[PDB]
Ligand binder design. Structure first.
Ligand SMILES: [Zn+2]
Lengths: 121, 148, 191, 104, 52, 156
RNA sequence: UCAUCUAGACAGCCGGACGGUGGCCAUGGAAGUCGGAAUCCGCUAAGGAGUGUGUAACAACUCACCGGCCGAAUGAACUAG
């Protein structure tokens, strides 16, 4: 049961990595569920946002390491609270939308991985 | 400048809210009655926008209210205060129309989902001639296009 | 269930030096030195790399492996007490009669005297254990600070000063008068 | 809100540990000097049961006397009066169930 | 009146305790069993009765 | 410490006899000093003296007056101790004190006021307008014992 | 005997704990939390038509759920020496 839900997560992640060349790693701190929900709706058409336990994710990437070897570079960046954005749009347009939306007294993009290349941005 | 939202059974406290805005209770009630002239029989959310002189009344769309209205209902005095249990026909088109009416207001996840949520909202209504409300929603893909 | 090997670690900072013959621990740091007899607890110590010391017990019962973590906490308290020090702040609490606290000297022994606690004519004197320094703090009304290296000596002196001001033959939920410890910390806290 | 102002006033005088008869004399003197908060009050004060009594206009010149607990809000006192109303109705229904068999 | 914070600090030691129902011992507020031997370390505890 | 707000008195806005803006009530029930003013007093010990004066027993009041007088005598410490608030509170308490049935209480009180004036002369102008009628009333009194020393002291 | 567990468990800190929807009756009110029934979807990593505090009703706070630090066993009920 727990394992079954977990197995599904592993599979979807693999599919997402294959589906979108552009990957954005986003760090969320003090972001409300409502704040997150709005961002998801704005980016529903061009982006996929994935949230998961890091321990779960690292194992998955290692499991899928033989295929898509360049994704290994993303693993050092995975540490800390993180989210994964998979998008057709290459870079800035997605980034601009994420930072701007729902800033209240705050989503940040920690790193960008595109086509096997990592950008601090 | 100031917006106040209240759930009001139509045809009609209000005064306490009105005093802060310095608006006559009777005037507000009359305006609300006219707005709910469409949603009077049953409780509906009413939005009052105050211009600092007068308040404008509109009826905000609510899933329960729209669903209750869709179920055909004989007008009820409510003096009886009966259970007034609501029984309804499938009304698949009306629910789809309701989903469209919501138009993914407040960001419903999908057009089909908005309809599914609308179906769930019919906890009160039977919502089908022979089925639990939204029991077959997962089963049938029909009407997904209609909601959009 | 006779755990055959359980083992804890203590970290030694750069400033201190710890000397352990049989079960006598001497910790020497910047603020001074402290010692401790531990011949009642029956553990074994082992220096690893001059900033780590493991303490272990072999074939121990449940009470014995409880005592292992206890002695680790004691020697670690000694290390952090000789590095950062220990400071207890206590506050005076009264309704009508103000508590008047001074420091007197019968035969040069640094007594703390307490006057007018609930208006009595009795004078409460608590002695001061050695190594504990007491300052009546400014800029906060009715606050006393006890500082030192030994958490045992500082907290015991603070507890003696708290217990000397107990109310008798009254409802103590209404007669809340006394001297109560409000803060426990280090002399160089947030170092 | 004005009942809450009167309650805050009487509770502020209570929290000074002031004598109850001196508080009543202070209410009488301020009624003579025309303070509205004092003039809303009725003088036989039930401070032993933490209860005051207040005059409210029936029409927005006749005034009614209503007892207010100092330890509950004005709305909470109103809910208590509503509760005493609701308990009275159930006894009346029990009487209506009684009437036929009793008179037979 | 003492002060609100100072009443809180004094009531931390005087009023925010628990009482063993068997031997009347004054106990920590989050305790589960009495620390005394004579009641047999029982778990019959009650909060200490406050004023007001 | 002292607690509560005199709302009814505050709405009244009456300084009564007092000309310094402080409510003065000869009558026992009203004109009592504000709790806030008492909280404002410079010394906790002073506060106690005021509390004692507030207390009903004549002996306790008398004892309190004595303590205050001795403190006034030590002006060097007491100049810091004296506060405008203290003076305002003093005026309010003094009004009740002059009315005292006991001769001793009145006499001590009158003497205390005179001592205060001498120590604080030229710094009590706002207070003077209030103090003078009260002091004068005491100095000219039917009873020789209260009046004669008070009068001599007044001249002094 | 049930459960959780290196795909990260139980304590401890820190963050989120959301929309349809103030779901349907009933009340002068009761919007998760006076009660009667039902108790379903969306977004989800995750969030009950609600665990309590909580207000006249709100608002607000906290929960059981998911997440960073921790890295390995732990929780409940019961039995008998
Ligand atoms: Zn016990």
């Amino acid at each position: 049961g727990i394992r079954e839900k977990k197995a599904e997560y592993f599979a979807k992640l693999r599919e997402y990595l294959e589906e979108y060349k552009s990957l954005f790693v986003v760090g969320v701190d003090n972001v409300s569920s409502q704040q997150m929900h709005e961002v998801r709706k704005e980016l529903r058409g061009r982006a996929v946002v994935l949230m998961g336990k890091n321990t779960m994710v690292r194992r998955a990437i290692r499991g899928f390491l033989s295929d898509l070897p360049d994704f290994e570079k993303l693993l050092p960046f995975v540490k800390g609270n993180v989210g994964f954005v998979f998008t057709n749009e290459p870079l800035t347009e997605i980034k601009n939308v994420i930072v701007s939306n729902r800033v209240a007294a705050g989503l940040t993009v920690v790193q960008v991985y595109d086509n096997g290349q990592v950008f601090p941005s | 400048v100031k917006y106040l939202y209240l759930r009001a059974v139509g045809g009609e406290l209000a005064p306490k809210i009105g005093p802060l805005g310095l608006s006559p209770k009777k005037v507000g009630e009359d305006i609300a009655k006219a707005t709910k002239e469409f949603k009077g029989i049953k409780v509906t959310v009413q939005l009052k926008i105050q211009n600092r002189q007068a308040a404008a009344s509109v009826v905000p769309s609510a899933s329960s209210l729209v669903i209750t209205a869709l179920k055909e209902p004989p007008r009820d005095r409510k003096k009886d205060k009966n259970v007034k249990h609501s029984g309804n026909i499938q009304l698949d088109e009306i629910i789809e129309i309701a989903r469209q009416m919501r138009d993914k207001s407040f960001g419903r996840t999908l057009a089909s989902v908005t309809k599914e949520i609308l179906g769930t909202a019919q906890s009160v209504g039977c919502r089908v001639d022979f089925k639990n409300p939204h029991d077959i929603i997962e089963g049938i893909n029909a009407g997904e296009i209609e909601i959009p | 269930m006779k755990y055959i090997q359980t083992e804890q670690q203590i970290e030694v900072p750069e400033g201190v030096t710890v000397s352990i013959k049989s079960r006598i621990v001497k910790v020497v740091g910047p603020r001074g030195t402290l010692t401790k007899n531990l011949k009642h607890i029956d553990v074994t110590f082992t220096k690893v790399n001059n900033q780590l010391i493991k303490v272990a017990v072999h074939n121990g019962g449940r009470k014995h492996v409880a005592a292992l973590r206890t002695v680790k906490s004691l020697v670690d308290n000694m290390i952090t007490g000789v590095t950062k020090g220990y400071k207890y702040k206590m506050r005076y609490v009264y309704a009508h009669f103000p508590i008047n606290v001074n420091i007197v000297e019968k035969d040069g022994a640094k007594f703390i005297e307490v006057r007018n606690f609930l208006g009595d004519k009795k004078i409460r004197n608590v002695p001061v254990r050695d190594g504990v320094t007491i300052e009546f703090s400014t800029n906060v009304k009715d606050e006393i600070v006890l500082s030192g290296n030994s958490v045992e000596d500082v907290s015991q002196n603070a507890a003696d000063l708290q217990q000397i001001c107990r109310v008798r033959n009254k409802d103590i939920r209404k007669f809340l008068d006394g001297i109560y410890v409000s803060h426990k910390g280090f002399i160089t806290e947030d170092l | 809100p004005l009942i809450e102002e009167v309650k805050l006033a009487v509770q502020g005088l209570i929290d000074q540990q002031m004598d109850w008869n001196t508080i009543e004399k202070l209410i009488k003197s301020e009624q003579k000097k025309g303070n509205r908060i004092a003039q809303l009050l009725n003088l036989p004060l039930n401070l032993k049961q933490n209860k005051i009594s207040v005059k409210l206009d029936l029409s927005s010149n006749e005034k009614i006397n209503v007892t207010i607990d100092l330890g509950l809000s004005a709305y909470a006192n109103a809910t208590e009066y509503f509760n005493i109303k609701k308990t009275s109705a159930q006894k009346q229904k029990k009487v209506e169930k009684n009437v036929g068999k009793a008179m037979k | 009146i003492i002060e609100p914070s100072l009443k809180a600090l004094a009531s931390k030691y005087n009023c925010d305790k628990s009482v063993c129902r068997k031997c009347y011992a004054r106990l920590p507020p989050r305790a589960t069993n009495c620390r005394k031997r004579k009641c047999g370390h029982t778990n019959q505890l009650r909060p200490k009765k406050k004023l007001k | 410490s002292f607690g509560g707000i005199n709302t009814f008195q505050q709405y009244n806005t009456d300084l009564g006899l007092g000309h310094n803006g402080v409510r003065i009530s000869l009558n026992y029930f009203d004109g009592l000093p504000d709790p806030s003013l008492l909280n404002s007093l410079y010394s906790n010990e002073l506060k106690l003296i005021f509390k004692s004066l507030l207390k009903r027993d004549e002996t306790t009041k008398e004892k309190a007056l004595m303590d205050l007088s001795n403190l006034i005598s030590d002006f060097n410490q007491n100049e810091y101790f004296f506060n405008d608030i203290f003076l305002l509170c003093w005026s309010q308490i003094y009004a009740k004190l002059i009315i005292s049935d006991y001769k001793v209480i009145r006499l001590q009180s009158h003497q205390i006021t005179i001592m205060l004036v001498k120590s604080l002369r030229k710094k009590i102008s706002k207070f003077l307008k209030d103090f003078i009628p009260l002091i004068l009333l005491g100095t000219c009194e039917l009873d020789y014992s209260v009046s004669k020393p008070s009068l001599n002291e007044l001249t002094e």
